[PDB]
Amino acid sequence: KTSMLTKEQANKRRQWYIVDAAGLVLGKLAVKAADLIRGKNKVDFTPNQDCGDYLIIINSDQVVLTGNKKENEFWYHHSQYIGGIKKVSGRDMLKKQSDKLVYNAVKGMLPDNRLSRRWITKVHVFKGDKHNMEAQKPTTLNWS
Amino acid sequence: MRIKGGKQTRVRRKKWLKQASGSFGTRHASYKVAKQTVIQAAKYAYRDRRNKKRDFRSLWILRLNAALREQGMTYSVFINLLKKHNIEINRKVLSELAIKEPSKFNLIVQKVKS
Amino acid sequence: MHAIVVCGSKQYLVHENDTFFVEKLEAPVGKEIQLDKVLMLDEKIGAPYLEKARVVCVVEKHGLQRKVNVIKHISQKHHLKKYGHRQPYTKLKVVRFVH
Amino acid sequence: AVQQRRSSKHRRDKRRSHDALTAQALSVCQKCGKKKLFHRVCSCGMYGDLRVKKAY
Amino acid sequence: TKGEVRGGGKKPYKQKHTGKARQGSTRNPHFVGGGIVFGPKPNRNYSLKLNKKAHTAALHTVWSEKLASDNTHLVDQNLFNKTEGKTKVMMQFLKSAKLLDKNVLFVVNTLNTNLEQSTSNIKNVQVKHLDKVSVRDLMLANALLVEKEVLKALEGKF
Amino acid sequence: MIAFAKQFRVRISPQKARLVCQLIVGKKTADAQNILSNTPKKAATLIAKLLNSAIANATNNHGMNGDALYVFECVANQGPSMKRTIPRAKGSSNMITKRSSNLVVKLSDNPNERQELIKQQKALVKKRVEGQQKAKMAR
RNA sequence: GCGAAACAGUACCGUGAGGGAAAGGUGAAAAGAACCCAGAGAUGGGAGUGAAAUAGAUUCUGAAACCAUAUGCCUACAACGUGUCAGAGCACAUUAAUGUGUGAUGGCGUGCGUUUUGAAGUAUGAGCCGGCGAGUUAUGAUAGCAAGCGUUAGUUAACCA
RNA sequence: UUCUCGCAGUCAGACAGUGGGGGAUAAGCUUCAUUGUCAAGAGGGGAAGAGCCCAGAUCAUUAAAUAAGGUCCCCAAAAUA
RNA sequence: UUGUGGUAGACGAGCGUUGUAUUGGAGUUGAAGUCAAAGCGUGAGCAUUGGUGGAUCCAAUACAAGUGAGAAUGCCGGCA
């Protein structure tokens, strides 16, 4: 008939990982962001439970796009009000909130799920390098 | 010769009404809506009998390729390692059943070159 | 410890002293049955099967899966074909294995 | 206006949830022993120690 | 039916300017009070017709089945005598035949007073004429007594 | 102990009866008569009769001390309403109903005695299940 | 069931011709709750009778729709024609069953009927439960099946016993 | 798919390709012959979809392999130059 | 071996309900009705058991149907 299968449930163990954007690009780090937050690279996956882990990205304010995308590609952010469009480009979010850049990038590429919106907070982004979450005794590894 | 025929009517409605229960709201309260929900759920289960394996095979391949990318090798060569050379009858789900037992799947994924 | 045994068209992970449910074999209760089809007990995989390797299992009962009521219908089409599927199966366990 | 769809039982319940009432104050009258409501008159009539109303 | 029920043709509502269901008569089969279009009527006949020869063949067959019942032996006019109506005597007769529930219908062609004198109290025992036989009545017996003088008529009737 | 006291259909809408007697569930008769004599509602003065009747029931028919008695259950059982009509405009007529309420009030002495009803229903359940059982051992 | 089980063509409707309803069953026999308590009151709780009052006049049985009460479970960042396949957790034990109750969450998920070129639709019908409710007959013809009789055949009608 | 018997249903079609007609070779337009589908047929791909490509589904299967189509994450699958 | 989409449409085998013809059985030692439950069936259904219930019902073979309701802006009565 059928082969019974079981999975780990309500015993998930998650860790803290360090990664830096010194010479990265948006897409090639955002793909790893989605991979880690989904936990699809580890065999501990369970769609009924959480699978990703904590992540810290530090100094997002030096990531660089290839080509003129920083000046010609635009993001519109419309509030519920009429004519609430905030127009941003690639070049301006470097001298402005780059945290929302990785934020909306990572949320756009995951399915609309109550866990995914709960997933997105497990990653922390600051343009600086100092944060009180540095006391987590975290496992450090590049390209994470 | 009059026959009311409301008794077997009561029985048939009752026997339609047991299975329609546990629903949110008055869905399982009246004859018509309860039967509509039962038929719709029967269709849903009929289609889900295919959908479940359609999604579980994808879950299989993703869970396997997790470990495969952990060891670097890909699923594309994995099938070549088994089916072409050293022909076996291994199936997808037993791979992850072996993954869930530590230090055993390593042996299988290492004899691929032997 | 483990074993990879295919009954019918379904391949199963089976350990020692484990009860499980497989497709119907029409086997009456009580006797001991040695199945031929088996692969990768713990090492030394044979290509199609494991040669001369037997899995000796005991059958204890035949059961049926819950009543499956299936109805086919198309909207506004005067077609409400109802049917009831019962799914037979054999509940049994293994006792021995030989190379 | 006129309703278009029937109101459900649970909408009736949620609208009725704020359509309830609270309790009331209560106090003790020293001379005329009675569990009277606070800052009101007592059974014998003395709101304070003053009772100009008839005791009947 | 729709025309048999007493009533008029007045319409409670007019044919428009109202979202009410359409009605056209005071009484309808789909309206309470009655008025079913088709029900019991005193015209249904259950008429059936079978040829005489086929019915006579069915007779001859059922007699021959009874004539081979082996529990319906011959009886003579004499033994109906010695009693007028004393069912006790006929009760002893019935007991001696070892019959309890046998719905014994007796064939008679002499109209001797003794038998129709009895056989009208208990539902079990009745006596009827040879000219009045019916196939169900013949097999309703399950035990019966035949008089020997009518054997001549039986062989004459084939 | 039940201390049940019935009323049988006094003319009040049960919606307002439940509305007034959420405020009494779980409380003690010591702090119930007073609050029932102060709240300015129509049903309030009307159910004080039932409350004191229940007090009399408890004190007389059984006769326990009753100092631990508390309000166990209020309910407004829906009886058969009355039907009337009134003329309206355009020759139309409005249809009006008169709702009454069957009221029975239960006073409990201990925070218990429902669990006993639970095992009573379980006793019904078991007598059922062994009744099913004897069908098989019957030879 | 005559519309009319019952004081029925009654009540009632229009002035008038005329139109036109609904509802029965207690229990063996009222033996119909003496008397006590609470409350003016009906009433309820006792007692007693009644086998039995949860048969107390609402008075054979009392489904469901409807309204409440509470065992346990789940729930206030949630985008859903509300369920299905899995599924932890929580509480347990049965028409002994790969047991049951609920479902944190994941995958999927645009009704019934009719109309039709085609309808999740903003085409229509349905607030809801329940009760009833619309393919039968006189004669005859055609076709199909089976039986009887039989290729100087076979069958009767009306009517009578 | 011939012939006879009996029951039919049905004459309101539309869509996609070609040949065309009309329009203005304009239409989710109108009308044909032909090639398929929907009506009367699920599903997968196409962002959903009445017809388009793969396609005709007894029931079950946390079985395998292919058709179209696809393998940066959602969303399952690849890389090499 | 062919199979097992399907309206219209056609074909075959069907189920339940009332009462009747029998052959039987059960019934205050609690019939049937009634609902609650984690049954048996390819189907209309068939059940098993308890309480409630307080008096006729049921198995099989045939017989004749006011014999089979989800919809009719349906009616009846109630609930909204």
Q: DSSP for F63-94?
A: ----TT-EEEE--EEE-PPEEEEEE-GGG-EE
Q: Among A61, A53, A65, A62, which residue's Cα sits nearest to residue A99? A: A61
Chain centre distance of CA D48: 20
Q: Counting Cβ atoms within 10 Å, is residue B94 exposed (0-12), middle (13-18) or buried (19+)? A: buried
The C-alpha atoms of residue B69 and residue B77 are separated, in whole angstroms, by: 12
Whether the CB-CB separation of E107 and E133 falls below 8 Å is answered with: yes
CB of E19 within 7 Å of some strand I atom: yes
Nearest to E138 by CA among E75, E70, E64: E64
User: Do B68 and B75 form a contact (C-beta atoms < 8 A)?
Assistant: yes
Q: Which two tokens stand for residue A65?
A: 């796009």
The dihedral built from the CA positions of residue F127, F133, F137 and F139, taken in this order, carries a sign that is positive
Strand H interface, A 25-54, C-beta < 7 A: 27, 31, 34-35, 38, 40
SS3 A85: coil
* Rounded (10°) CA dihedral D14, D18, D24, D25: 120
Torsion C31-C35-C39-C44 (CA) sign: positive
* Number of independent structural domains in chain C: 1
Q: Å from B38 to nearest chain D CA?
A: 21
Rounded to the nearest angstrom, the minimum Cα separation between D49 and chain F is 21
Do residues C47 and B88 make contact, with C-beta atoms less than 8 angstroms apart?
yes
Contact residues, chain B, for C43 at CB < 8 Å? 107
User: What whole-number distance in Å separates Cα of residue B22 and Cα of residue F69?
Assistant: 38
Residues of D in contact with B26 (CB under 8 A): 8-9
Sheet architecture: strand order including A139-140: A123-126, A54-58, A16-20, A139-140
In the 8-state DSSP scheme, what is residue E87? Answer: H
Is the minimum CB–CB distance between C39 and chain B shorter than 8 Å?
yes
Nearest CA in chain A to C10: A1
Mutation for F interface: D17, D35, D38, D39, most F CBs within 10 A: D35
DSSP structure class, residue D38: T
Using the CB atom, is residue A4 less than 7 Å from strand H?
yes
Residue F104: closest CA among F85, F79, F123, F130: F79
Q: Which long-range contacts (CB under 8 A, 24 or more apart) does C65-69 make?
A: C65/A1, C65/C89, C69/B19, C69/B42
∠ Cα C67 C70 C71 (to 5°): 150
SS3 E106: strand
Note the strand H nucleotides within 7 A of protein beta carbons: 40-41, 43, 59-65, 72-79
Structure letter (DSSP) for residue A43: T
Residues C64 and C91: their CA atoms lie apart, in Å, by 10
Eight-state DSSP code of residue B83: I
Three-state DSSP at A144 gives: coil
* Strand G proximal to E22 Cβ, under 7 A: no
Protein-to-nucleotide distance from the CA of A5 to the C1' of H63, whole angstroms: 15
**Alpha-carbon gap, residue B12 to B5, rounded angstroms:** 11
Give the three-state DSSP class for A105: helix
Q: How many CB pairs under 8 A join D and F?
A: 17
Dihedral of CA atoms F26, F27, F32, F36 in degrees, nearest 10, equals -40
Residues from A in contact with B at Cβ < 8 Å: 3, 5-6, 40-43, 45, 47
C-alpha distances in angstroms, E98 versus C33, D43, E92, E131?
63, 98, 10, 28
| CA distance from start to end of chain C | 13
CA of B3 to C1' of G20 (A): 29
d(CA A7, CA C34): 31
Of the residues B53, B56, B62, the best mutation for testing chain A's interface (the one with the most A CB atoms within 10 Å of its CB) is: B62
State phi, psi for F66 to the nearest 5 degrees. Answer: 80, 5
> At C13, which helix (H) or strand (E)?
strand C10-13
C-alpha dihedral over C11, C16, C18, C24, to 10 degrees? 40
Pairs of residues, one from chain B and one from chain C, whose beta carbons lie less than 8 Å apart: 37
Spell out which residues of F between 76 and 105 contact strand G, using CB within 7 Å. 78
Distance CA F18, CA F43 (A): 10
Q: How far is Cα F19 from Cα F42, in angstroms, rounded to an integer?
A: 11
Q: Which nucleotides of I are covered by protein (CB under 7 A)?
A: 5-8, 16-18, 21-24, 33-37, 39-46, 48-51, 64-76, 78-80
Phi then psi dihedrals of residue F87, to 5 deg = -65, 145
The whole domain housing F71 covers 4-135
Which is nearest to B91 in space by CA: B61, B52, B114, B50?
A: B61
Q: Which helix (H) or strand (E) holds B35?
A: helix B31-70
| Residue B25 contacts D, CB cutoff 8 Å | yes
- Cα distances (Å, whole numbers) of residue A69 to A64, A91, A92: 10, 8, 12
Q: After which residues is chain A broken (C to N over 2.5 A)?
A: none
CB contact under 8 A, C40 and B108: yes
Residue A50 is encoded by which pair of tokens? 């959480």
Structure token pair of residue E46: 């259950």
Angle at B44 between CA B41 and CA B49, to 5 degrees: 125
DSSP A44: T
Q: How are beta strands F101-108 and F76-78 bridged, if at all?
A: antiparallel
In 3D, which of F4, F16, F13 has the Cα closest to residue F97? Answer: F13
Coil, helix or strand for C88? strand
In order of F93, F119, F120, the CA distances from F114 in angstroms are 49, 9, 9
Give residue numbers, 65 to 84 of C, with CB < 7 Å from strand I. Answer: 66-67, 72, 77-84
Q: Could you tell me the CATH number of the domain that includes residue F47?
A: 3.90.470.10
Determine the residue of chain B that is closest to D11 in CA distance: B25
How many CB atoms lie under 10 A from the CB of residue B77?
A: 11
Residues in chain E: 158
**Distance between CA atoms of residues D24 and D35, nearest Å:** 12
Beta strands in F1-139 (DSSP E): 5-6, 70-73, 76-78, 82-87, 93-98, 101-108
The CA distance from D13 to C64, in Å, is 45
Close Cβ partners of C64 (under 8 Å, ≥ 6 residues apart): C86, C87, C88, C89
What angle, rounded to 10 degrees, do the helices at B92-99 and B31-70 form?
70
Nearest CB to A43; choose among B66, B93, B94:
B66
Q: How far is the CA of F125 from the C1' of I32 (A)?
A: 24
CA distances from D39 to C23, D25, D35, D47 (A): 82, 9, 12, 7
Categorise residue E34: left if φ over 0, alpha if ψ from -120 to 50, beta otherwise: left
Contact C89, C64 (CB under 8 A): yes
- Could you please report the per-residue DSSP string of C29-83? TT-EEEE---B-SSS---SSS-TT-EEEEEEEEEEEEEEEEEEEE-TTSS-EEEE
Give the count of beta carbons closer than 10 Å to the beta carbon of residue B38: 19
Closest residue by Cα to residue F51 from F65, F71, F67:
F71
Which residues does a gap of C–N over 2.5 Å follow in chain E? none
CA-based nearest residue to F104, from F82, F68, F72, F80: F72
Asked if D20 and F22 count as a contact pair (C-beta separation under 8 A), the reply is yes
Contact (Cβ atoms closer than 8 angstroms) between residue C40 and residue C47 = no
| Domain range summary for chain A, segments of one domain joined by + | 1-144
How does strand E146-147 pair with strand E74-75? Answer: parallel
Resolution of this PDB entry, in A? 6.7
Tokens encoding E107: 């064939």
**Buried-exposed string F28-66: b where 16+ CB fall within 10 A, e elsewhere:** ebeebebbbebbebebbebbeebbebbbebbeeeeeeeb
Closest CB to C47 among B87, B91, B97: B87
- Tokens representing residue F109 in the block: 């002495």
Q: Is E108 left (phi over 0), alpha (psi -120 to 50) or beta?
A: beta
Closest CA to C4 of B109, B108, B55: B108
Number of structural domains found in chain F: 1
Q: How far apart, in whole angstroms, are the C-alpha atoms of residue F95 and residue E72?
A: 80
Q: Which of E112, E119, E110 is nearest to E90 (CA)?
A: E119
Beta bridge partners of A124: A56
In sequence order, the β-bridge partners of residue E65 are: none
Residues 27-66 of C with CB under 8 A from A: 65
The CA distance from D14 to F54, in Å, is: 33
The integer distance in angstroms from the CA atom of A62 to the C1' atom of H31 is 68
Give me A107's structure tokens.
């949320």
The span from the CA of E120 to the CA of A64, in Å, is 119
Structure determined by: cryo-EM
DSSP SS3 for A87: strand
**Could you tell me which chains touch chain C, where touching means 3 or more CB pairs under 8 A?**
A, B
**What are the C-alpha distances in Å from B49 to residues A1, A7, B2, B43, F75?**
13, 21, 47, 10, 48
Q: Would you say E29 and E36 are in contact if contact means Cβ atoms under 8 Å apart? A: yes
> H/E element holding F98?
strand F93-98
CA distances for C93 relative to B94, C97, E55, angstroms: 19, 12, 71
Buried b / exposed e over C40-75, threshold 16 CB at 10 Å, is: bbeeebeeeebeebebebebeebeeeeeeeeeeeee
CA dihedral E132, E138, E144, E145 (to 10 degrees): 40
The Cα–Cα gap between D45 and D56 comes to 9
Q: CA torsion F108→F114→F116→F118, rounded to 10°?
A: 170
* C54-73/C80-98 β-pairing: antiparallel
CB–CB of A54/A122 below 8 Å? yes
| Residue whose tokens read 């009355």 | F82
Are F57 and F3 in contact by the 8 Å Cβ rule? The answer is yes
3-state secondary structure of C4: strand
Both tokens of residue D47? 């709101």
Spacing of C-alpha A100 from chain mean position = 10
Containing domain of residue C53, as a range? 1-99
Q: Report the alpha-carbon distance of residue E112 to residue E75 in Å, rounded.
A: 13
